[PDB]
Write a protein that binds this DNA or RNA. Structure first.
Ligand SMILES: [Mg+2]
Ligand SMILES: [Mg+2]
Ligand SMILES: [Mg+2]
Ligand SMILES: [Mg+2]
Ligand SMILES: [Mg+2]
Ligand SMILES: [Mg+2]
Ligand SMILES: [Mg+2]
Ligand SMILES: [Mg+2]
Ligand SMILES: [Mg+2]
Ligand SMILES: [Mg+2]
Ligand SMILES: [Mg+2]
Ligand SMILES: [Mg+2]
Ligand SMILES: [Mg+2]
Ligand SMILES: [Mg+2]
Ligand SMILES: [Mg+2]
Ligand SMILES: [Mg+2]
Ligand SMILES: [Mg+2]
Ligand SMILES: [Mg+2]
Ligand SMILES: [Mg+2]
Ligand SMILES: [Mg+2]
Ligand SMILES: [Mg+2]
Ligand SMILES: [Mg+2]
Ligand SMILES: [Mg+2]
Ligand SMILES: [Mg+2]
Ligand SMILES: [Mg+2]
Ligand SMILES: [Mg+2]
Ligand SMILES: [Mg+2]
Ligand SMILES: [Mg+2]
Lengths: 211, 205, 156, 122
RNA sequence: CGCGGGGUGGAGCAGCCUGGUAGCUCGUCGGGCUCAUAACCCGAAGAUCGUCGGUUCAAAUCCGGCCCCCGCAACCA
RNA sequence: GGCCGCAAGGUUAAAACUCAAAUGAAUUGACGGGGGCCCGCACAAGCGGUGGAGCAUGUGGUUUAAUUCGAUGCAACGCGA
RNA sequence: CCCGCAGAAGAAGCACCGGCUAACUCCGUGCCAGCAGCCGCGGUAAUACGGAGGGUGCAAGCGUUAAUCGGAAUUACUGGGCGUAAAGCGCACGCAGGCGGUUUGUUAAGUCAGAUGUGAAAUCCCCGGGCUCAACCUGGGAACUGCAUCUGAUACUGGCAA
């Protein structure tokens, strides 16, 4: 069958929104276009900075970006040079005065987006897909994830026939709404085509809800 | 007959040091001793039972400079002879005259020793012997004849032999340039890394 | 201390409603050289898991064999499903002359000189089991003297 | 099985016939190409395999495969044949010897030259 | 920087050579034991094998890089 | 070929040629106009329809300079749109 | 056979590299050309067809074919089987033949032990010797598993007697 998006089905219940601002129908679409532009530019720039989650937050006359990243040192660089460059570019893109904040992810082995990006990086660098996915699963379980599942799909090892391979350890209850399933995907553009990577990480269950 | 190709190639393929060069310089400095020779040298394929047996036999043959027919004859004689077959085979290979000359130290390499023996530089009991495969007997004196006593390569080889570890089963006088073959080298005197079971099994298929 | 070697890996199928499900079987033999030898057979969806399971099973369920100076004590026969096996105490220096699975089992067991031949079926699993059984059914001069109520000098 | 039964009637060795009876225990034999043509191979494979019907010096008329790319053979061409069948050709149990009497070596071969009668290039 | 050796639960030690198997003692907790401590017995917890990689069906082990630690290294007026 | 038989035939008993399998037991599925058990608007019990008419709409076909391309058992045909 | 002369000077090839089986990549071709001992390979990324580079194995040889034994316990004496895989006559009676409960005596045929004669030399094997070594030649032994005759043993088998 076809499974629902774990993040989308858990929005509001346990997962927050990435963009968090109010807008009337007059400015809704323009806000969406600008947010798309900002996220695209930021990912393209900080591809090698291990960025996990861009969070856009708009005061009525301001744009506040919050970059969740594993290595703040590289994104900020020398004192404030790189952040100021990013701030000025995002300001011109948005057309509004901008303010960039940086949140450090202390455990990049439990972040699904970072894990998927690392696997795709390894796949592009022509490692063995089983080796890469087993390393990711072992690292997450060692770091203490309640569960993790990783799936790779399409022309594995340059094979003419496409296949899907997946490894799960621990438990990853998808149907439990109150669970905390971090999920993200990535694509490795190998010389034989695209290889899709999906990662589920069950970190726990939030009883209190806490939206 | 004699292998005339690159010698470090054989050493790399086998993996160990076969002492195919004089030993003034490290074999790691002279070549990539770790990597196998060829386009696909970096890859290390897994060897099967027949592979390792063949490898061991090739190692011994390349070390001593013996082709398949002569080596097979050596094995046949060793099997026929009483006692341990592998030990007898090693004893015969040691008994070879070129090996004896190299052990005494009148040659930087076994090839150099064979060169001297072929070019009639070696007297055994006052008899000029020309065959490298000549089996030396116990209590045999082996001496360099006066024609070759002037060669500088013999003295350089003597210095290299002094550098090397001395064999107990021989007694060599460098001033006289002559050594006595006291006794057949025991298995304890011979190198431990060489395995004989593989050779015996390979030829006892 | 325990020397171990993998004899054979075989691919097998299950043929389920959807398609065919493949899995791997590993036959391994471990031994201490000093006389203890034990075989193991494992199965998993992947080769490394199967080999590790076989290694664990082989590490367990060992058996001691009475070795005389690194060789057998008397000619011994061994039988199983198809494998009929004969082994002879050859002289020192002959080496282990045996075919495949028997070679592996005897080498890890620690016997350095035997003359063996496998009659009948030569299926690796059955021949390993038959060889181990034959090694088990081999008594020493001390054992026969004790059971017969005599001294070793009377038995010779 | 019983030794008494064996004494009455011993065990009679199973005489295995040769698979190349036209050679008559000879390594090669000379013949004349009665006809040169091509044939379709057996089921799992496909090609136009070159074969010769050859009248041997000892009266036998056999069919022989022509190995290598291209051949100059024709009718009334004396050739030398050896043993060996082509499997996926019904009734062909002999090979022609390339580089033999009135048979040219394969052109432009650099490997297996000895098998195809090709002389060493300079 | 030159050469060599080393890095394994918190500490002190095996396991490295032969690629498959994380062990021993002290320390911690609990129980029994002791009136209790102590001693003794039984359990339970604790490394990811310095780290980054490479090889391989599979790496504490094989190879390389980096990080450190130690020994050796010729220089202080 | 021999022997036996009125005959039908019986008995003794090859070779050339041809293939790389033929077979025995058992294992997991799928299937059976095999067997048992169970469920679902599956049937049965009911109500309202479609198939007839006109028109709307999609498809096939035919036509056209073009009638853009795709979906086309259930699970395409008021589908992408 | 020895001594002298000159100068690396005159002297390396063949098969193979998918598994069995030690040794891999690229290019050309596209169920064609072709390969093949078996299993198979080739329909557009061929480690299996051709060429190249690299490698592996032998080497003045290397491959192919033919032939015998081996592996083949696949004619099984050593050393197999016959309920369903090939294999118990449809069933019985019975001659020749094969086998023979138990005790004693006797014989000495089988059996065993010893001795004698012979079993040509060469070949095979062991210890030596001579060709510079080896092949080769050679001294002495061992062996030639056998046959015959004689002298003994009498447990078993056979004969004879009860
Ligand atoms: Mg859905
Ligand atoms: Mg069989
Ligand atoms: Mg008839
Ligand atoms: Mg309903
Ligand atoms: Mg109805
Ligand atoms: Mg209608
Ligand atoms: Mg239609
Ligand atoms: Mg259409
Ligand atoms: Mg269409
Ligand atoms: Mg519809
Ligand atoms: Mg190979
Ligand atoms: Mg070929
Ligand atoms: Mg190609
Ligand atoms: Mg080719
Ligand atoms: Mg043949
Ligand atoms: Mg036979
Ligand atoms: Mg049978
Ligand atoms: Mg039947
Ligand atoms: Mg039957
Ligand atoms: Mg019956
Ligand atoms: Mg009787
Ligand atoms: Mg009778
Ligand atoms: Mg008598
Ligand atoms: Mg004679
Ligand atoms: Mg001599
Ligand atoms: Mg003689
Ligand atoms: Mg009697
Ligand atoms: Mg009697």
């Amino acid at each position: 069958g076809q499974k629902v998006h774990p993040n989308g089905i858990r929005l509001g219940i346990v997962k927050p929104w990435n963009s968090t601002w109010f807008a009337n129908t007059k400015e809704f679409a323009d806000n969406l276009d600008s947010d798309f532009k900002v996220r695209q530019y930021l990912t393209k720039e900080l591809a090698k900075a291990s960025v996990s989650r861009i969070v856009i937050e708009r005061p009525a006359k301001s744009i506040r970006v919050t970059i969740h990243t594993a290595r703040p040192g590289i994104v900020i660089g020398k004192k404030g040079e790189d952040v100021e460059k990013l701030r000025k570019v995002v300001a011109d893109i948005a057309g509004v005065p901008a303010q960039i904040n940086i949140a450090e992810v202390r455990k990049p082995e439990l972040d699904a987006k970072l894990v998927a990006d690392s696997i795709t990086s390894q796949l592009e660098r022509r490692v063995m897909f089983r080796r890469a996915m087993k390393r990711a699963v072992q690292n997450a379980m060692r770091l203490g994830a309640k569960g993790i599942k990783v799936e790779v799909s399409g022309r594995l090892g340059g094979a003419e026939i496409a296949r899907t391979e997946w490894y799960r350890e621990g438990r990853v209850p998808l149907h439990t709404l109150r669970a905390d399933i971090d999920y993200n995907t990535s694509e490795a553009h190998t010389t034989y085509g695209v290889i899709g990577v999906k990662v589920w990480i069950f970190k726990g269950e939030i009883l209190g809800g806490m939206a | 007959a004699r292998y005339l190709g690159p010698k470090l190639k054989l050493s790399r393929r086998e993996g160990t040091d076969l002492f195919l060069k004089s030993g003034v310089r490290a074999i790691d400095t002279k070549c990539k001793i770790e990597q196998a020779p060829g386009q696909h040298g970096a890859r290390k394929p897994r060897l099967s039972d027949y592979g390792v047996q063949l490898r061991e036999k090739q190692k011994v043959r390349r070390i001593y400079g013996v082709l398949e027919r002569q080596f097979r004859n050596y094995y046949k004689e060793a099997a026929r002879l009483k006692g341990n077959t592998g030990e007898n085979l090693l004893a015969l290979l040691e008994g070879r005259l070129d090996n004896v000359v190299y052990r005494m130290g009148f040659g930087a390499t076994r090839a150099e020793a064979r060169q001297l023996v072929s070019h009639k530089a070696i007297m055994v009991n006052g008899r000029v012997v020309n065959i490298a495969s000549y089996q030396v007997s116990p209590n045999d004196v082996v001496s360099i004849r006066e024609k070759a006593k002037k060669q500088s390569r013999v003295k350089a080889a003597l210095e290299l032999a002094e550098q090397r570890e001395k064999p107990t089963w021989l007694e060599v006088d460098a001033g006289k340039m002559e050594g006595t073959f006291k006794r057949k080298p025991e298995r304890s005197d011979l190198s431990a890394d060489i395995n004989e079971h593989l050779i015996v099994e390979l030829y006892s298929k | 201390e325990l020397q171990e070697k993998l004899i054979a890996v075989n691919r097998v199928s299950k043929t389920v409603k959807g398609g065919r499900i493949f899995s791997f079987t590993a036959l391994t033999v471990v031994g201490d050289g000093n006389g203890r030898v034990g075989f193991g057979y494992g199965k998993a969806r992947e080769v490394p898991a199967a080999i590790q399971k076989a290694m664990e099973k082989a590490r367990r369920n060992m058996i001691n064999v009475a070795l005389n100076n690194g060789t057998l004590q008397h000619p011994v026969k061994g039988v199983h499903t198809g494998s009929r096996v004969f082994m002879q105490p050859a002289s020192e220096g002959t080496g282990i002359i045996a075919g495949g699975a028997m070679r592996a089992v005897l080498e890890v067991a620690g016997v350095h000189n035997v003359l063996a031949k496998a009659y009948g079926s030569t299926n690796p699993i059955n021949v390993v089991r038959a060889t181990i059984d034959g090694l088990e059914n081999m008594n020493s001069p001390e054992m026969v003297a004790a059971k017969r109520g005599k001294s070793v000098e009377e038995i010779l | 099985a019983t030794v008494n039964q064996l004494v009455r009637k011993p065990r009679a060795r199973k005489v295995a016939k040769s698979n190349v009876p036209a050679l008559e225990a000879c390594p090669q034999k000379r013949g004349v190409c009665t006809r040169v043509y091509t044939t379709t191979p057996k089921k799992p494979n496909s090609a136009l395999r070159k074969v010769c019907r050859v009248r041997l010096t000892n009266g036998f008329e056999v069919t022989s495969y022509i190995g290598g790319e291209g051949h100059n053979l024709q009718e009334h061409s004396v050739i030398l044949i050896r043993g060996g069948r082509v499997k996926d050709l019904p009734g062909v149990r002999y090979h022609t010897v390339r580089g033999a009497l009135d048979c040219s070596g394969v052109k432009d071969r650099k490997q297996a030259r000895s098998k195809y009668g090709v002389k060493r290039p300079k």
